[PDB]
Design a protein around this ligand. Structure first.
Ligand SMILES: Cc1cc2nc3c(=O)[nH]c(=O)nc-3n(C[C@H](O)[C@H](O)[C@H](O)COP(=O)(O)OP(=O)(O)OC[C@H]3O[C@@H](n4cnc5c(N)ncnc54)[C@H](O)[C@@H]3O)c2cc1C
Ligand SMILES: Cc1cc2nc3c(=O)[nH]c(=O)nc-3n(C[C@H](O)[C@H](O)[C@H](O)COP(=O)(O)OP(=O)(O)OC[C@H]3O[C@@H](n4cnc5c(N)ncnc54)[C@H](O)[C@@H]3O)c2cc1C
Ligand SMILES: COc1cc(C=O)ccc1O
Ligand SMILES: COc1cc(C=O)ccc1O
Lengths: 524, 524
């Protein structure tokens, strides 16, 4: 029977009773079959790391406060999910193995308010991108969401891990406006203009008066968020999505150097541009076995067969244009002129291309217009038992940096028997190298190889000045360990704040490598 | 001889010696004549409130750390300035009367780095908007700053109070990217991607890994900032600034309701739109005595005389358009069509109007193109000894709310013998009512009346759900007191963090109403 670390069988029995006394017997789950549902689907080390001792589903803010107070009484560590679909980063699994999962999304799943004219929503954690899309289409159709690739995630949960989408509102944390948060001893606070009783402005300016705190609750164990506002973009009058195929792996350098000047002013590259390699485009519409059934990495002739059969390049650029048709034509003209300088570049619109090779184009056209999709889950059929772990370091949006990272990561992936499926994404002034490290989750050796590969990728990236933005439970200590300027000054600051707010060391211990005192330096 | 609160003459002597040993004799100032220079120029209520006991000018980060350690040893409270031009909010005056001022800007005044292609600067606190503008014009001329009305302020200091300008980069804190900060016991830390030694990305993404903390150092006493990055916008190929005059004070409702839909998508209102009343337009180019020399409020016929003589409306709208001249013409066309629905509206371009009444138009044309100015200081010649206090609550960008505020504020201003000079500003989805309450700083009665008026304005605004964004030393306790959702949960959070980071209660005690334990509840 899984016990939280540092809690006696007796204290755990007492805590479960107290939790049931608040949320109801139905909403305290301890059966192995119910706990198995919160397993990381894509485990990277031992599959048995990151287990839940229980899952608690509080009805509302008041119940969150009371479960937090009970946790403080009995020293119960509590991890937190909204929808818990953080796949690539641990799913719903706690960093601290044996923690009790607070499932905020199961019961706190209401769209509390949508203002169509001022363009915002006030939301609870259980609202999925599908849920909010459905609500806006029925009740506020001039607005659109900004969604990640998969719509089953939480508008709140994704933003609290600083996740991202691909519309002009792609930076989810940027558009987060106002929070209600239960602090680690059970006090509730509203941020920003929400701290002013009766304010009408909670969702229209992020800051409020005095220190601005909301960011301290993102990639954070300082609070359980119960309500979160987000700004919503107005649907433009029209949109068009285009694909640019580039023949040569060496085109990456010139693509990035043309991309930056066209994105940095948010026009003509109006949405978040993505540059996907042949493998993460081919893997949506085909299986690895379709191209190659030998052992070792995919040979060049397998890559060439994918390009030819599917009509794709080694690098595949996807962008969306918004506005009246005259603006779209004009901006597309500038884009075609700029990227057309690259020999072998080919341009297709979402209304021009409708074949197997256009599947990603049509999906990006949904995503880039705030229409949520689960099409990208087909990537997980590339190989049997496929799982991914996220690797997404930040670099300057400079072709030379792109080429260095492309070569560094692919050569290590080849060495560790993992296919090189990756994209380069430029937000505004920053570049992300998002590598989908696909592995057989059912194979202990493949899980070990993926963990070893990722630790090596993080260290080599950090040595080049490229820090990881978001990581898996298994990598959080290592990634925080790379941000050790001033003899670990950033982590010492985080620890000082964690220990002051959370003296009993209750909320999601080890999230982002930040351990409260009672669990720190204990090797977990 | 001014002593800090809670420090013996002996401990103060010891501290000043240790400070001289670090920064140099010349950079520890205690002469009454040098201290008088750090007096609030626009004191509200008692002029003698908010005195400095000394001013310390550290050469660099290392000296800031050592002066902070000395302060911790001797319990010396230390306030902070960059350029100390926070006029309307206390100037360089400490919230805690008798604090020692850390003058970061005097010697830490270097532009450390400007990247033209990636559009950012890394700066020290002493860099003024004039300094940065001059540097860009000489060494990176494709970039422009975003400046407030007066260029003598600090790019860093203004951002740390969440100040604002009027280009698309008007939200200074939003474009702040990376900080170096000395924490209250003397530890130094870098935020974001700067926490990774050798990172190449400090100024190109704000967040980093783990809880995002930079907002906690704005309107804050949690540390002394020694370096700050800021993103810099590319100069567009062309710009035009326009003035719309509106005849009727009652036009405000329709102006705000037309403004919001044209701004919320950042086009066609591409810059920060400002709507200035006759008095803050007239006060730049004339004196109150020019229009009226009787006692009591300005009569309506005095307002009408200002309008006609200067060719101004009751409400004067200023906006800027950017892009190729065809985009400017097109956007200006949409703006003229929309606001032209208001009878009596008149449109003038920065190339069409060059008379006394076009002074503000030509100044906005500079400011809205990141050309810093001191023209708005002419406002302080309105009446003899003029000073102002800032009142700037946030509201929904809705005409009804604007009208309510206009009337509430003007009515009270009349009662308290102060002219209503104000503007309405829409950032994106929020509105600011920025009232410049002008008063005779040399007149004890006028200072007392201004403080009484502002306390009343804050309470009445708060009762309507309109919170203050930024305030004077004298008002910080009251303003924080209005953000008291959940029995003051926000301030209790800020106090918990202050006491953890600052156990000896050293940095800018009482900033934003946040007092460390040793000074809290002592009425100062
Ligand atoms: C093929 C594939 C594609 C992906 N594409 C993208 C993509 O385009 N963009 C993207 O951003 N991600 C992407 N992901 C990663 C991940 O799937 C999504 O980010 C997903 O939306 C996150 O899970 P969630 O929304 O259910 O959040 P959750 O799992 O509910 O929460 C995420 C984290 O936030 C914190 N948390 C959640 N709720 C609270 C709360 N109430 N209070 C305090 N803390 C809380 C916890 O740390 C938690 O682990 C992708 C993954 C895969 C496998
Ligand atoms: C007529 C008039 C017009 C104005 N127009 C505008 C305007 O358009 N926009 C606007 O924003 N303001 C405006 N102001 C207010 C004010 O003049 C400006 O904001 C000014 O730029 C602020 O002073 P500063 O830049 O010198 O900053 P400082 O006074 O140096 O710093 C401001 C505050 O930041 C903190 N701080 C400073 N340095 C540090 C540091 N190194 N570490 C930690 N904390 C620090 C302190 O709390 C300090 O009080 C106006 C004022 C007047 C009188
Ligand atoms: C697992 O992390 C991510 C995955 C993707 C798509 O593969 C995009 C952004 C991410 O953060
Ligand atoms: C006095 O403070 C301010 C003044 C102005 C312009 O008068 C704009 C924003 C401010 O915060």
């Amino acid at each position: 029977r899984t016990l939280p670390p540092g809690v006696s069988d007796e204290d755990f029995t007492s805590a479960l009773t107290a939790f049931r006394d608040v949320v109801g017997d139905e909403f305290v789950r301890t059966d192995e079959a119910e706990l198995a549902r919160f397993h990381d689907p894509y485990p990277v080390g031992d599959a048995d790391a990151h287990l839940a001792s229980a899952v608690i589903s509080p009805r509302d803010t008041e119940q969150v406060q009371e479960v937090v107070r009970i946790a403080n009484r009995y020293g119960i560590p509590l991890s937190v999910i909204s929808t818990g679909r953080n796949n690539g980063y641990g799913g719903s699994a706690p960093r601290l193995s044996g923690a009790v999962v607070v499932n905020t999304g199961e019961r706190m799943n209401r769209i509390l308010e949508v203002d169509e004219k001022l363009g915002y929503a006030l939301l609870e954690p259980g609202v999925t991108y599908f849920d909010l899309h459905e609500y806006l289409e029925a009740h506020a159709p001039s607005l659109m969401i900004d969604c990640p690739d998969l719509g089953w995630g939480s508008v709140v949960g994704n933003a609290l891990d600083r996740g991202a989408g691909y519309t002009p509102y792609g930076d989810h944390f940027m558009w987060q406006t106002g929070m209600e948060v239960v602090l680690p001893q059970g006090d509730v606070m509203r941020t920003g203009m929400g701290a002013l009783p009766g304010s009408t402005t909670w969702q229209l300016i992020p800051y409020g008066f005095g220190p601005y705190p909301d960011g301290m609750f993102t990639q954070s164990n300082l609070g359980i968020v119960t309500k979160m506002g987000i700004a919503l973009m107005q649907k433009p009058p029209a949109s068009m999505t285009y694909q640019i195929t580039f023949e040569n792996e060496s085109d990456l350098e010139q693509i990035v150097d043309i991309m930056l000047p066209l994105r940095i002013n948010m026009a003509p590259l109006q949405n978040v541009p993505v540059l996907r390699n042949i493998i993460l485009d081919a893997a949506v519409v085909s299986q690895r076995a379709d191209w190659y059934d030998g052992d070792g990495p995919l040979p060049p002739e397998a890559i060439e067969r994918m390009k030819k059969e599917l009509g794709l390049g080694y690098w595949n650029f996807y962008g969306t244009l918004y506005g009246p048709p005259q603006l779209i034509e004009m901006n597309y003209g500038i884009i075609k002129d700029a990227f057309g300088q690259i020999p072998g570049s080919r341009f297709q619109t979402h209304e021009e291309r409708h074949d197997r090779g256009a599947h990603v184009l049509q999906d990006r056209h949904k995503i880039n217009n705030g229409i949520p999709s689960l099409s990208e889950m087909k990537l997980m059929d590339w190989i049997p038992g496929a799982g991914h772990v996220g690797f997404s370091p930040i670099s300057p949006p400079v072709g030379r940096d792109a080429m260095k990272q492309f070569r560094m990561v692919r050569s290590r992936a080849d060495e560790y028997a993992k296919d090189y499926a990756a994209q380069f994404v430029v937000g505004l002034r920053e570049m992300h190298h998002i590598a989908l490290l696909l592995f057989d989750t059912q194979d202990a050796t493949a899980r070990n190889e993926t963990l070893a590969l990722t630790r090596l990728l993080i260290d080599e990236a950090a040595a080049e000045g490229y820090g990881e933005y978001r990581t898996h439970n298994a990598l959080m200590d290592q990634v925080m360990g790379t941000y050790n300027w001033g003899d670990g000054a950033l982590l010492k600051f985080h620890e000082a704040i964690k220990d002051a707010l959370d003296p009993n060391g209750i909320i999601a211990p080890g999230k982002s490598g930040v351990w409260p005192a009672r669990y720190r330096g204990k090797g977990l």
